[PDB]
Amino acid sequence: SERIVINVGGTRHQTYRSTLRTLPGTRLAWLAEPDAHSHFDYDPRADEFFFDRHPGVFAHILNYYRTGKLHCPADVCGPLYEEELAFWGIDETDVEPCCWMTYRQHRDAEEALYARYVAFASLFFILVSITTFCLETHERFNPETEAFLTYIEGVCVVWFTFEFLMRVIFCPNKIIDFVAILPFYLEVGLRVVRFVRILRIFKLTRHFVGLRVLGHTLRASTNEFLLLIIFLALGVLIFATMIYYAERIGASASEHTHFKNIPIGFWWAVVTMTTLGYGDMYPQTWSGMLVGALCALAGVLTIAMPVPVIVNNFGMYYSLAMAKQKLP
Amino acid sequence: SERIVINVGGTRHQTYRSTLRTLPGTRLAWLAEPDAHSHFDYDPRADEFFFDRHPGVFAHILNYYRTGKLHCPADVCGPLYEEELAFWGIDETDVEPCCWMTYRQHRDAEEALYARYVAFASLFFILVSITTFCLETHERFNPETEAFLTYIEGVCVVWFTFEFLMRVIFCPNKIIDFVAILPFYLEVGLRVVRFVRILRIFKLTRHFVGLRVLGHTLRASTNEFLLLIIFLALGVLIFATMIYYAERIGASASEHTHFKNIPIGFWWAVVTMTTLGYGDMYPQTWSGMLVGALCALAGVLTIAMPVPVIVNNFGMYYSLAMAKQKLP
Amino acid sequence: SERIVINVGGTRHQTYRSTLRTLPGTRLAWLAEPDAHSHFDYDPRADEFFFDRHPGVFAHILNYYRTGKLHCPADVCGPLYEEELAFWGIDETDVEPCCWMTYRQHRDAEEALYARYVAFASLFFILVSITTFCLETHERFNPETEAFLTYIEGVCVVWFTFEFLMRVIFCPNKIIDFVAILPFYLEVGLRVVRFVRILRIFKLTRHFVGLRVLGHTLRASTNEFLLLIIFLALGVLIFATMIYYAERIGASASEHTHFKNIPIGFWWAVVTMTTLGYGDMYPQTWSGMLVGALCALAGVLTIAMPVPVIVNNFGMYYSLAMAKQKLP
Amino acid sequence: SERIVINVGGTRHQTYRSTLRTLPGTRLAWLAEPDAHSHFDYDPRADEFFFDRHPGVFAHILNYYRTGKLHCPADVCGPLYEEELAFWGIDETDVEPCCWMTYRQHRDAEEALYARYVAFASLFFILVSITTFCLETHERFNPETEAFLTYIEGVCVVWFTFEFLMRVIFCPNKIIDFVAILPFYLEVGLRVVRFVRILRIFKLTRHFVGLRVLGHTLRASTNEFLLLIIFLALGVLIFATMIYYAERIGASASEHTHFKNIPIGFWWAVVTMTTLGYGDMYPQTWSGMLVGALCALAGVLTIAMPVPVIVNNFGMYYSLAMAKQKLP
Ligand SMILES: Cc1ccc(S(=O)(=O)n2ccc(C(=O)NCc3ncco3)c2)cc1
Ligand SMILES: Cc1ccc(S(=O)(=O)n2ccc(C(=O)NCc3ncco3)c2)cc1
Ligand SMILES: Cc1ccc(S(=O)(=O)n2ccc(C(=O)NCc3ncco3)c2)cc1
Ligand SMILES: Cc1ccc(S(=O)(=O)n2ccc(C(=O)NCc3ncco3)c2)cc1
Ligand SMILES: [K+]
Ligand SMILES: [K+]
Ligand SMILES: [K+]
Ligand SMILES: [K+]
């Protein structure tokens, strides 16, 4: 029945105390008791409680005692509204689900997001080791492998051993060591042997900002990969079956076509849904053609639906990383 | 000729009553009659009508008695403005068509959007039945089908019958039962027979949130599929005709090329507009090459025009579903 | 040196008259002369000029006499700010070029954007005529064309003549008639003859809202087509030359490869830049492979750069058309 | 302990001087000393300091002495807030990294972004020279090159020499001259010889606005090219190795498949990651098929992650160029 005047920095808001006592735990509710005159800045000639805060968002906080819900403005960023919430006693978890995903979310994007002359003296050997690995397989140095290649990689491993004689000698305590510095253990005496020779680049690929952002993205968006894989698996199964039966109705067995099984149809339905189209297997009857024309479009759609959700994350994280790089 | 002072929560707005009587059905219009002093909170010393509401949107409501049109702000969400509209007596259908699609919509996105150990004991059998179906066709277990596969699927159907001896016994009343629990009716005694064996996954594909959002999208956007199909059909017809005639002018019949008919040109014009390109049929004359270079681009455009409209829906619905999942 | 108080609807703005006389043609400038007391609503006890307008944008208008430039807010739509501009005497062409493309935009998107039982009795004949045209070419009804097909199309043309005996008889005056109702002139006595038989669908393709929006888009964005064609032509020329010379350095003539000319390289460079890839012509030397790996990416980029500009137009126009369809 | 009233144009903001002395270098801090009454517009009856500026952003400036951080509003553009910052003494480099990339951003998009009858008399010769170059290679005018083609290009070079007899004669001082007007030096007496004949179009391709915007984009976004190249190189290396070993486990050498080396796998892994798919090399074992189905998706993702960042730049720059073209 009575009115009180919350003067939030020059621009006074009036309300009924019956409105302020809707949520009795927060700070504003304390104003309503007949004791607040002994706690806050009560000017005893205009009866207004001074509160020296941003007056352009407090009219959205107070629009949580008036109606009953709490929304976020669109004229302030996340952290500004969050600081104001934290002040006034409101909880940052009553935000309605419409104004929540565009308010969390810079808070979910923070995400913790002269020996510099031998770093190149290690990168050079990393790259030459990658090259020697990629050339050991070529059937030009295998008339039986030529000796100069194993000599080169011997120099590489005798330098990597030298570098591994400091990361255990001068380190204080006791990921990129056990299953990533394995080729050093290997050369001294092939799939799992030398796949790891190429993994050493993931050691230095943390000093580049773009790959740090990519790594943070590939783990802050780990649901939109299950989603994409499940979409693609459903599509592959459905369209493999459809194309098998379609090609079958088009005239003692299936010897006039490529899709002889439902399994082998998975290869086709995945080189078609992705709009790849090698050309090893394609439809050859009008029913097969209709099913393929359906498959291409369904694939475009079920791939383009979650990939934008994946991509906005990288956009935001990379924008933040560059903004942090371009500021002192 | 007279002025009145609508004090909407501390920040008074003045107007002429001649402005407030533009729409005589709403609440504000009642203020103008020489009786409102007996209805509302009329402070009889400053002559201001108190109205204890958000003062940052009421200056957009009142900007519907001043000009004549009603627009929505961009510093508040949908539901906030909608609640304020509902209060003041304004109708939410006078919104101009520019400020309408970005005001409807969180209202069109709500869209209604220990026996948990046998659910896995049903999913296991669903998956093994899918696998046995996909392996019955392979020409490795058909020297004539091997007996262990029909034995396996017999175990599967004798478990699904057991599970179907409760969904009719203990159910109160009397979609996923008639045309989805058909293989149980089948095995006891092939296209329409066993296509349905794979449909059982659509029973469990409602417990995943991503597929619920996909299902809601595929039906809240059922116009943008007719649109895409019509675009693609027009493109296919036009470019099939163009490529037939083009390949024809390039020198007694058409025995030097692939496009011998206007029908068979549909397959090409749809594996090209989608940027698929198998390679079974391609142009082989300079006029055919120009028409194909036109077809690829027209296809990219007439596919990328409505697909973003389809994709924004999934983006919004999935954002809402995740926000609702991440909040108590 | 003196201050005056523009009371724009309850929320008074103070300024110096020396500020208001920056642009002497507009309305506000009239307030500054020592005569405005005889023109406007001058309350001669608080010395404030009443102006009964939106007080949330006038603080952006007045921020054109203070600094010297004119910007648009982001908390109001286009037409709202435009109406306020039109009132205050400001011109809508002084808007700075940053706040202009997001202010023009609904103004550039307006863009002018029981005989209903014989419309189907014409669409049926249109479709059957399209089908008879597409089947006249097939080498199944050409053992020499079978008589039933020309009989069918004779029925079609004898109905279209009947319908053309009203659009000249009962029309008041004197596009879709001369070069679109040509087959009627044709059958009574082949490229340009019967391409037009398929054009009749563009007569009815104006009653669908999606194709109306597509037609408005394809002409409100006629610069972003010259742009795309020029990008693609530059790319095609550059990469055709590059791939010719590359494939040439890889070891008396060029008889070991596909790219024997710079012209024929255009076909490849356009089925590759569009990520189509038929497979009729591909690189076969390491230099050719590097150039092709460059071509694919340059094509993706120079196609994806203007296509989003093309697509936003359709997005906006279609949103507007649907908003206008969903409102009385 | 004391309060002061910054009247920023009609809408007074109150604060404690203890708040205004948080940053003692800026202008507002001067208000707090017991001398400001002799410097600013101090009305000595309401004790308010007049400051005649936009009152809708100063409540965000002052929200930098209250909390400690500085954010940008979303209801004003970049340059407006920047002008207000510049006024008040605040530095435009304390902006928090969330509100920075959407505040820089028009400032990072400005970026410096009757002889007109012989310009066509040069473009004609440029185009005919391009055509003669592209036709010198064709094996239709090489029965040995026909004389009319070298005659034509002789006319072209004797006109380009004439035009090069003015750009050195009447030019005041002493890029598009040394390595771009080289064919004139060439014809008077082939890879590096005549690649440059096509470079002359880059001389005139600065008079088109679309290509000016493209050129500004291709250099304001030179990090997102290193990023894309590094993503693609990592992908190519990883998936080349994976597909080699996969195809190897699928059953004395590798004579049953295409991927015989890790190098040649780069061609495949780059015509697949880009969703090109020629069809010259594809997987032929189930493990190869799984790895290829992984490669297509990883390629789609690692290409679509930085390309939107590249594309937004062209969008913004082109919008600005068109807005500047459409305004006096
Ligand atoms: C000391 C130092 C300074 C700068 C950088 S660095 O950040 O500038 N930098 C250089 C190369 C890479 C890289 O990760 N290359 C991967 C690759 N491409 C093809 C095969 O492997 C990153 C690293 C170390
Ligand atoms: C009781 C329970 C708990 C969780 C889930 S669940 O939601 O986590 N869940 C699991 C599998 C699927 C699925 O739909 N798989 C489809 C498919 N992929 C390849 C062929 O078929 C969904 C379901 C039930
Ligand atoms: C009287 C009336 C009512 C509705 C419509 S209508 O708007 O609903 N409508 C129907 C078909 C089309 C169309 O344009 N079809 C093109 C096509 N597809 C394949 C070949 O040609 C549009 C038209 C007329
Ligand atoms: C005097 C004047 C006026 C207008 C223009 S102009 O700006 O309108 N203009 C015209 C052609 C181009 C162009 O760059 N063409 C490239 C190309 N396409 C295929 C091969 O090469 C640009 C230029 C000069
Ligand atoms: K493709
Ligand atoms: K392809
Ligand atoms: K392709
Ligand atoms: K292909």
D101, A319: Cβ pair inside 8 Å?
yes
- Percent of chain C as helix, strand, coil, to the nearest 5: 50, 5, 45
Quote the crossing angle between the two packed helices C307-325 and B286-304, to the nearest 10°.
Answer: 50
Which residues form ligand 3's pocket by a CB distance below 6 Å? Answer: B 230, 233-234, 237; C 116, 119, 201, 204-205, 207-208
Query: With left for phi above 0 and alpha for psi between -120 and 50, is residue D209 left, alpha or beta?
Result: alpha
* CA dist., res. B206 & res. D166, Å (int): 77
By CB atoms closer than 10 A (0-12, 13-18, 19+), residue D195 is middle
Q: Ligand 2 pocket test: pick from B208, B211, B212, B214 the residue with the most ligand atoms within 8 Å of its Cβ.
A: B208
Contact between D293 and A270 (Cβ < 8 Å): yes
Q: Which of B273, A270, B83, A160 is nearest to D275 (CA)?
A: A270
Query: In the beta sheet, which residues pair with residue D4?
Result: D15
Q: Which of A163, A158, A189 is nearest to A176 (CA)?
A: A163
Ligand 4 atom closest to the CA of C230, numbered from 1: 18
Task: Indicate the pairing of strand C3-8 with strand C11-16.
Answer: antiparallel
Which residues form ligand 4's pocket by a CB distance below 6 Å? Answer: C 230, 233-234, 237; D 116, 119, 201, 204-205, 207-208
* CA dist., res. A5 & res. A11, Å (int): 10
Ligand nearest to the CA of B241: 3
Structure tokens at D114: 């009757």
Q: Three-state DSSP class for B42?
A: strand
Distance A211 CA to ligand 1 centre (A): 10
Q: Which of A176, A186, A192 is nearest to A154 (CA)?
A: A186
Ligand 1 atom closest to the CA of A208, numbered from 1: 7
Q: How many CB atoms lie under 10 A from the CB of residue D247?
A: 24
Show binding-site residues of B. 71, 77, 98-99, 275-278
* CA dist., res. D83 & res. D92, Å (int): 10
Q: What is the DSSP letter of B135?
A: H
Task: Indicate the pairing of strand D41-43 with strand D48-50.
Answer: antiparallel
Q: Distances in Å between the alpha carbon of D44 and those of A80, D20, D33?
A: 35, 20, 16
Q: Distances in Å between the alpha carbon of D8 and those of A142, B13, D12, D41?
A: 82, 20, 6, 11
Nearest to B10 among A14, A16, A296 (CB): A14
Q: Report the b/e string of B308-323 with b at 16+ CB within 10 A.
A: bbbbebbbbbbbbbbb
Q: Ligand 1 pocket test: pick from A205, A211, A212, A213 the residue with the most ligand atoms within 8 Å of its Cβ.
A: A205
**Does the annotation place A276 within a ligand binding site?**
yes
Q: Distances in Å between the alpha carbon of A303 and those of A41, A62, B3, D328?
A: 59, 44, 60, 45
Backbone angles phi, psi at C43, to 5 degrees: -70, 110
Q: How many CB atoms lie under 10 A from the CB of residue B246?
A: 22
Chain A within 8 Å of C279 (Cβ-Cβ)? yes
* CA dist., res. A286 & res. D172, Å (int): 71
Kind plus residue range of the DSSP H or E element containing B319: helix B307-325
Q: How many CB atoms lie under 10 A from the CB of residue A195?
A: 16
**Complete edge-to-edge strand list for the sheet that includes strand B11-16:** B11-16, B3-8, B48-50, B41-43
Structure tokens at A146: 């030529």
Task: Indicate the pairing of strand B3-8 with strand B48-50.
Answer: parallel
Q: Please name the amino acid found at residue D245.
A: Y
Q: Please name the amino acid found at residue A156.
A: C
Kind plus residue range of the DSSP H or E element containing A269: helix A265-273
Q: Which of A130, A156, A149 is nearest to D263 (CA)?
A: A130
Long-range contacts made by residues D158-166, C-beta under 8 angstroms, separation at least 24? D159/D122, D159/D125, D160/D122, D160/D125, D160/D129, D160/D184, D161/D188, D163/D122
The three-point CA angle B274-B279-B280 to 5° equals 110
Contact between B319 and A101 (Cβ < 8 Å): yes
Structure tokens at B267: 């397959």
Kind plus residue range of the DSSP H or E element containing C13: strand C11-16
Å between C220 CA and nearest CA of chain D: 14
| DSSP assignment of D223-236 | HHHHHHHHHHHHHH
Structure tokens at C127: 């479709």
Q: Distances in Å between the alpha carbon of D138 and those of A257, B204, C254?
A: 40, 62, 11
Q: Which residue has the tokens 């302030």?
A: A76
From chain B, the residues in CB contact with D279 under 8 A are 278-279
| First-last CA distance in chain A | 54
* CA dist., res. D310 & res. C303, Å (int): 12
CB-based contacts of D87: which residues, under 8 Å, 6+ apart? D27, D53
Q: Which residue has the tokens 């064609």?
A: C229
* Rg from Cα positions in chain D: 32
* Rg from Cα positions in chain B: 32
**CA quadruple C56, C62, C64, C68: dihedral positive or negative?**
negative
Q: Distances in Å between the alpha carbon of B294 and those of B272, B287, C247?
A: 10, 11, 27
What is the separation of C-alpha A311 from the centre of its chain, rounded to a whole number of angstroms? Answer: 8
In the Cβ-directed half-sphere of D84, how many Cα atoms lie within 13 Å?
A: 22
* CA dist., res. B244 & res. C190, Å (int): 12
Q: Three-state DSSP class for A119?
A: coil
**Does the annotation place D276 within a ligand binding site?**
yes
Query: In the beta sheet, which residues pair with residue A222?
Result: none
Length of chain D: 328
Q: Which residue has the tokens 């990023």?
A: D227
Query: In the beta sheet, which residues pair with residue D70?
Result: D95
Q: How many CB atoms lie under 10 A from the CB of residue D41?
A: 12
Q: Three-state DSSP class for D318?
A: helix
* CA dist., res. C165 & res. C151, Å (int): 21
Q: Three-state DSSP class for D43?
A: strand
* CA dist., res. B288 & res. B266, Å (int): 15
* CA dist., res. D240 & res. D272, Å (int): 11
Query: In the beta sheet, which residues pair with residue B42?
Result: B49
Nearest to A271 among D234, D241, D277 (CB): D277
Chain B within 8 Å of D279 (Cβ-Cβ)? yes
Cα torsion through C245, C251, C252, C257, rounded to 10 = -70
Q: Which of C163, C160, C192, C165 is nearest to C179 (CA)?
A: C192
Q: Which of D83, D11, D322 is nearest to C68 (CA)?
A: D83
Largest pairwise CA distance in chain A:
102
**A 187-246 residues with CB below 8 A of D?**
191, 195, 198, 201, 205, 208, 210-211, 214, 217, 228, 232
* CA dist., res. A2 & res. B50, Å (int): 12
Q: Three-state DSSP class for B186?
A: helix
Q: Which of A220, A225, A224, A208 is nearest to A109 (CA)?
A: A220
Contact between D135 and D149 (Cβ < 8 Å): yes
Query: In the beta sheet, which residues pair with residue A15?
Result: A4
From chain C, the residues in CB contact with B14 under 8 A are 7, 9-10, 50, 52
**Does the annotation place A277 within a ligand binding site?**
yes
Q: Which residue has the tokens 């080498």?
A: C139
Chain C within 8 Å of D314 (Cβ-Cβ)? yes
CATH C-level class of B3-109:
alpha beta
CB-based contacts of C164: which residues, under 8 Å, 6+ apart? C181, C184
Beta-carbon pairs below 8 A across chains A and B: 151
Contact between C41 and C50 (Cβ < 8 Å): yes
* CA dist., res. D213 & res. D315, Å (int): 9
What is the separation of C-alpha D327 from the centre of its chain, rounded to a whole number of angstroms? Answer: 23
* CA dist., res. C6 & res. C65, Å (int): 13
Q: Please name the amino acid found at residue A86.
A: A
Å between B211 CA and nearest CA of chain A: 8
* CA dist., res. C301 & res. C312, Å (int): 18
Backbone angles phi, psi at A50, to 5 degrees: -75, 140
Å between A245 CA and nearest CA of chain D: 22
Quote the crossing angle between the two packed helices D307-325 and D223-249, to the nearest 10°.
Answer: 150
* CA dist., res. D81 & res. D112, Å (int): 21
Neighbors of chain B by Cβ distance (3+ pairs < 8 Å):
A, C, D
Q: Please name the amino acid found at residue A91.
A: D
* CA dist., res. D300 & res. C301, Å (int): 14
Q: Which residue has the tokens 């005139």?
A: D204
Contact between B32 and B55 (Cβ < 8 Å): no
Q: What is the DSSP letter of B235?
A: H
Q: How many CB atoms lie under 10 A from the CB of residue B155?
A: 13
Kind plus residue range of the DSSP H or E element containing A16: strand A11-16
Helices and strands (H and E) in chain B: how many: 14, 4
Nearest to C75 among A75, A275, A278 (CB): A75
Backbone angles phi, psi at D15, to 5 degrees: -150, 170
Q: How many CB atoms lie under 10 A from the CB of residue C274?
A: 24
Chain D within 8 Å of C279 (Cβ-Cβ)? yes
Long-range contacts made by residues C147-154, C-beta under 8 angstroms, separation at least 24? C152/C128, C153/C129, C153/C187, C154/C187
| DSSP assignment of A55-100 | TTTHHHHSTTTSSS-B---SSS-HHHHHHHHHHHT--TT-B-STTT
Chain A within 8 Å of D289 (Cβ-Cβ)? yes
Resolution in units of Å? 3.0
Contact between D291 and D246 (Cβ < 8 Å): yes
Q: Which of B12, A14, B58, B48 is nearest to C11 (CA)?
A: B12
The three-point CA angle A108-A110-A113 to 5° equals 130
Q: Is the CB of A233 under 6 A from ligand 2?
A: yes
Q: Please name the amino acid found at residue C5.
A: V
Q: What is the DSSP letter of B252?
A: -
Cα torsion through B287, B290, B291, B292, rounded to 10 = 120
What is the separation of C-alpha B78 from the centre of its chain, rounded to a whole number of angstroms? Answer: 19
Q: Is the CB of B205 under 6 A from ligand 2?
A: yes
Q: Which of C227, C254, C252, C230 is nearest to C243 (CA)?
A: C254
Ligand 3 atom closest to the CA of C209, numbered from 1: 7
Contact between D213 and D113 (Cβ < 8 Å): yes
Contact between C229 and B294 (Cβ < 8 Å): no
Q: Three-state DSSP class for A7?
A: strand
Q: From which experimental method does this structure derive?
A: cryo-EM
Contact between D265 and D240 (Cβ < 8 Å): yes
Q: Which of D163, D233, B256, B305 is nearest to C290 (CA)?
A: D233
By CB atoms closer than 10 A (0-12, 13-18, 19+), residue B306 is buried
* CA dist., res. A319 & res. A317, Å (int): 5
Kind plus residue range of the DSSP H or E element containing D13: strand D11-16
Contact between A197 and A160 (Cβ < 8 Å): no
Structure tokens at D32: 């707090």
Q: Ligand 4 pocket test: pick from D114, D117, D123 the residue with the most ligand atoms within 8 Å of its Cβ.
A: D123
